[PDB]
Design a protein around this ligand. Structure first.
Ligand SMILES: *[C@@H]1O[C@H](CO)[C@@H](O)[C@H](O)[C@H]1NC(C)=O
Ligand SMILES: *[C@@H]1O[C@H](CO)[C@@H](O)[C@H](O)[C@H]1NC(C)=O
Ligand SMILES: [Mg+2]
Length: 503
């Protein structure tokens, strides 16, 4: 029903789950205070900032046409038609949106048809990377399977070249482990066994996965690209069978305490990753100073207020509440919302430099904006330092050829405490791997050798390597004859007579 509108020379569409799914008779349920209101307000914060920037779009004002998805894909489609009739009211240049992947999938299916570029800030489905279906979709949040590069890198650091994999049934597990296979292959890493897990699976069947993993004793590292329920039930089975693996797990496990519910011994030693975001102070100040009377531009703020504070404007018990009151907790995806808007603004600024080099004002070269040129030539080719990034960081906003966002993950380790059991940040994956070994108990005291996960033990000084043409993880050690010298790692060479090597 309601729509948030802002006038500008160029207008950006927006799609947010301001309300939860309706359910029965109603189309829209209660307000999403964090995933809805706070994300919505991070786009308005961003638009405000760009419009005050003397360098980015100096003479072009950005407006907005923001709609509520109601968390339902069908509802988001009916609303999204406002963007397509506008591109032929007021033309929509791009759409910043799609929270849920179901709503971005359906919206990307409509927008491609009318060539409207779209950048999502929270839609992580791997399905959205299929450019034969969603060819106008790009995103600031990385696809769930991008962490496979950070995972394959963690292995390479510890020289774990022979590992086992466990992946959840579904798009998350399947595409993630497919991405891991490829990244591993590239880093000269082999997969001993590949097992599958499902929620439908019994307590008896999770033990079958542990027994499968135990069939490959040399592969002590188990790489998980599994959902929380799967990772939890796997550790429970590993626990029951006294099976000790060196876990390297995706954000499905991440730093969650619930995944390690009564399976602390099995989990001890794990390496897990989570998607990282930094906070933005300027946003905290902006949001916390919002009130129903001063924030009239957001049509959903009165309903948000009455809900959050349990007040009523009729009962006049609303004006007594504040957002400064409680300490501000910034939602996970805020940074990506701010980046999605800025990516659209940089793409447009770069296009205006190309098609409009005589002014700062908008020309007929951009009246209207060519969607195809905007997406392929400018949106895809953006590289800018992230807005509001911390002082010591070198964070950068860019996309791959499929419009997939380049991400940053934190690396954690599960350890035995004072007794108790906790997660400790051990490193990170920026555009490369960096972690402090001194923070992992199974490396930190020098005590004990590194956990092994090789297919073959190293050859002695007197032996050459024997590999199958192509295959390189597994080898045979072939001892050079007493009279033989080693030319290289794979070749021996006779010295006839009157010649011998430095033994
Ligand atoms: C494997 O890892 C160790 C550090 O854990 C490193 O010093 C060594 O050079 C690596 N081996 C190879 C073959 O590069
Ligand atoms: C667990 O397995 C180890 C060998 O890896 C064995 O020495 C020990 O007795 C077992 N512990 C329990 C609690 O069953
Ligand atoms: Mg400006």
């Amino acid at each position: 029903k309601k729509v948030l509108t802002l006038e500008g020379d160029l207008v950006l569409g927006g799609l947010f789950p301001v309300h939860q799914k309706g359910g029965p008779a109603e189309d829209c349920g209660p307000v999403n205070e964090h995933r809805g209101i706070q994300r919505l307000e991070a786009m308005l914060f961003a638009l405000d900032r760009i419009n005050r920037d003397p360098h980015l779009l100096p003479g072009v004002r950005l407006g907005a046409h923001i709609l509520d998805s109601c968390s339902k894909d069908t509802h988001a489609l009916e609303q999204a038609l406002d963007f397509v009739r506008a591109s032929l009211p007021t033309a929509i240049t791009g759409v910043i949106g799609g929270s849920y992947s179901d709503v971005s999938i359906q919206v990307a299916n409509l927008l491609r048809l009318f060539q409207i570029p779209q950048i999502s800030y929270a839609s992580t489905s791997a399905k959205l990377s299929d450019k034969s279906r969603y060819d106008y979709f790009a995103r600031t949040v990385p696809p769930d399977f991008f962490q496979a590069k950070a995972m394959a890198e963690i292995l390479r650091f510890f020289n774990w070249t022979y590992v086992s994999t466990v992946a959840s049934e579904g798009d998350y597990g399947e595409t993630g482990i497919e991405a891991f296979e490829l990244e591993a292959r590239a880093r000269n890493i082999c997969v001993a066994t590949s097992e599958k897990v499902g929620r439908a699976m019994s307590r008896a069947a999770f033990e079958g996965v542990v027994r499968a993993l135990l069939q490959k004793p040399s592969a002590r590292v188990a790489v998980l690209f599994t959902r929380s329920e799967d990772a939890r039930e796997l550790l429970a089975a590993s626990q029951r069978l006294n099976a000790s693996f060196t876990w390297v797990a995706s954000d499905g496990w991440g730093a969650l305490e619930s995944v390690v519910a009564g399976s602390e011994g099995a989990a001890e030693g794990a390496i897990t990753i989570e998607l990282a975001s930094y906070p933005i102070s300027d946003f905290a100040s902006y949001f916390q100073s919002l009130d129903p009377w001063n924030n009239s531009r957001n049509p959903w703020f009165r309903e948000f207020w009455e809900q959050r504070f349990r007040c009523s404007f009729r009962q006049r018990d609303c004006a007594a509440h504040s957002l400064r009151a409680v300490p501000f907790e910034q939602e996970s995806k805020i940074m990506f919302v701010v980046n999605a808007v800025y990516a659209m603004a940089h793409a447009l600024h770069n296009m205006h430099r190309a098609l409009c080099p005589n002014t700062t004002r908008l020309c007929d070269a951009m009246r209207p904006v060519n969607g195809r040129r905007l997406y392929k030539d400018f949106v895809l080719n953006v590289k800018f330092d992230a807005p509001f990034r911390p002082a010591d960081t070198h964070n950068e906003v860019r996309f791959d050829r499929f419009g997939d966002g380049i991400g940053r993950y934190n690396i954690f380790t599960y350890l035995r405490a004072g007794g108790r059991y906790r997660y400790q940040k051990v490193g990170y994956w920026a555009e490369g791997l960096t972690l402090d070994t001194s923070l992992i108990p199974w490396a930190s005291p020098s005590a004990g050798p590194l956990p092994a996960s090789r297919c073959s033990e190293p050859c002695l000084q007197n032996e050459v390597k024997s590999v199958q043409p192509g295959e390189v993880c597994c080898w045979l050690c072939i001892p050079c004859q007493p009279y033989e010298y080693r030319l290289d790692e794979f070749t021996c060479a006779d010295c006839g007579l009157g010649y011998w090597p430095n033994a």
